[PDB]
Ligand binder design. Structure first.
Ligand SMILES: OC[C@H]1O[C@H](O[C@H]2[C@H](O)[C@@H](O)[C@@H](O)O[C@@H]2CO)[C@H](O)[C@@H](O)[C@@H]1O
Length: 370
């Protein structure tokens, strides 16, 4: 059973659900329609379950890459924002919400990795990756290191590998070509080679992971790290006078980190599709709406141009958006799973010696296009 005459929305417990409830209240005040916001555990797993029997919430909020599987099963309705409404959000955000050409959700916020540096020991962060080997040598003369970041997860090393030419799946005409994979090209090898060279020359350690790199930076042992907005609070506590800026370039090309877009989708079984569109387009996605949510829990950078211009007064937020625009929207298709597993293995093998760069990426490329 559906509901009709009301809206039930689902959003994770780590987002600003009280603020979203407040926009829901204004909605009821204006139109008279009731809006109920819920935040159940493991909601991203429950949705495909209940939605399959024609039940669940009218609207669901979650990273866009999850909507791919939902769209595949016909769980999400096709949205119809006109050209004028689409012009209100940054163009690249609409690419993260289409499946097989159809628009299946509204972009809300944008997230991506940035370069984080310690202002006290490094007032002027490097503009290029090539500069780092030398910067590390000067800093070591005082018992400090230049950079430390997670080398165990491919999500963190990919920005560098992608810089000069690497890509997961080719995107064109709003579609991904599962046959045009770019982890085996010249650019990718140049990027990984530079990464392996860093470890051989003793600038980084092949075993460094998330906790290890985070501690080094927060203790002031290393001058920089690479992380996302989910890590700022831990830095605030450490008391390090930190900065968040654009990632370094490689061979003159910007680093290209994967982008995650918080999005709002409409249950295909909902009899309240027009109510959902009214609420999402003219209440939530306004300076007033996103403001309400942001106050409760910060959204980071947002897709709405007008509000993003206001939030950008914060240099950390301005950085997140700059790195995201220079990055690669994470693919929402089934094969991306193969990509992750194949690339993880290659990076770890080339870093440990288990395999050379040329061979590691060659095998990865072979497994993914299988
Ligand atoms: O390393 C592969 C891994 O990358 C992504 O995970 C990110 C996530 O997107 C970020 O929001 C944050 O949590 O850091 C994660 C890396 O630990 C993909 O989302 C994930 O599916 C993939 O396995």
């Amino acid at each position: 059973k559906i509901e009709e005459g009301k809206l039930v929305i689902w959003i994770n417990g780590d987002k600003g659900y009280n603020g979203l409830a407040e926009v829901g209240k204004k909605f009821e005040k204006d139109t008279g329609i009731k809006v109920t916001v819920e935040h159940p555990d493991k909601l991203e797993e429950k949705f495909p379950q209940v939605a399959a029997t024609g039940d669940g919430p009218d609207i669901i909020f979650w990273a866009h890459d999850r909507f791919g599987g939902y769209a595949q099963s016909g769980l999400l309705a096709e949205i119809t924002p006109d050209k004028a409404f689409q012009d209100k959000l940054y163009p690249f955000t609409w690419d993260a919400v289409r499946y097989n050409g159809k628009l299946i959700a509204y972009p809300i916020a944008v997230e991506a990795l940035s370069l984080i540096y310690n202002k006290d020991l490094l007032p002027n962060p490097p503009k290029t990756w090539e500069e780092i080997p030398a910067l590390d040598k000067e800093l070591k003369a005082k018992g400090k290191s230049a950079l430390m970041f997670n080398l165990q997860e491919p999500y963190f090393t990919w920005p560098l590998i992608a810089a000069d030419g690497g890509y997961a799946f080719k995107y064109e005409n709003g579609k991904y070509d599962i046959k045009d994979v770019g982890v085996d090209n010249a650019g990718a090898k140049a990027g990984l080679t530079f990464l392996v060279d860093l470890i051989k020359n003793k600038h980084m350690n092949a075993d460094t992971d998330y906790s290890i790199a985070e501690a080094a930076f927060n203790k002031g042992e290393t001058a920089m790290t690479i992380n996302g907005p989910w890590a700022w609070s831990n830095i605030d506590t450490s008391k390090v006078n930190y900065g968040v800026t654009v990632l370094p370039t490689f061979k003159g090309q910007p680093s290209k980190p994967f982008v995650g877009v918080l999005s709002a989708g409409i249950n295909a079984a909902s009899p309240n599709k027009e109510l959902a569109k009214e609420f999402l387009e003219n209440y939530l996605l306004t300076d007033e709406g996103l403001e309400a949510v942001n106050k409760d829990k910060p959204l980071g950078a947002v897709a709405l141009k007008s509000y993003e211009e206001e939030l950008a007064k914060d240099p950390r937020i301005a950085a997140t958006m700059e790195n995201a625009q220079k990055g690669e929207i994470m693919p929402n298709i089934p094969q991306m799973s193969a990509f992750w597993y194949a690339v993880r293995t290659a990076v770890i093998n080339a870093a440990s010696g288990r395999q050379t760069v040329d061979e590691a990426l060659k095998d990865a490329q072979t497994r993914i296009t299988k």
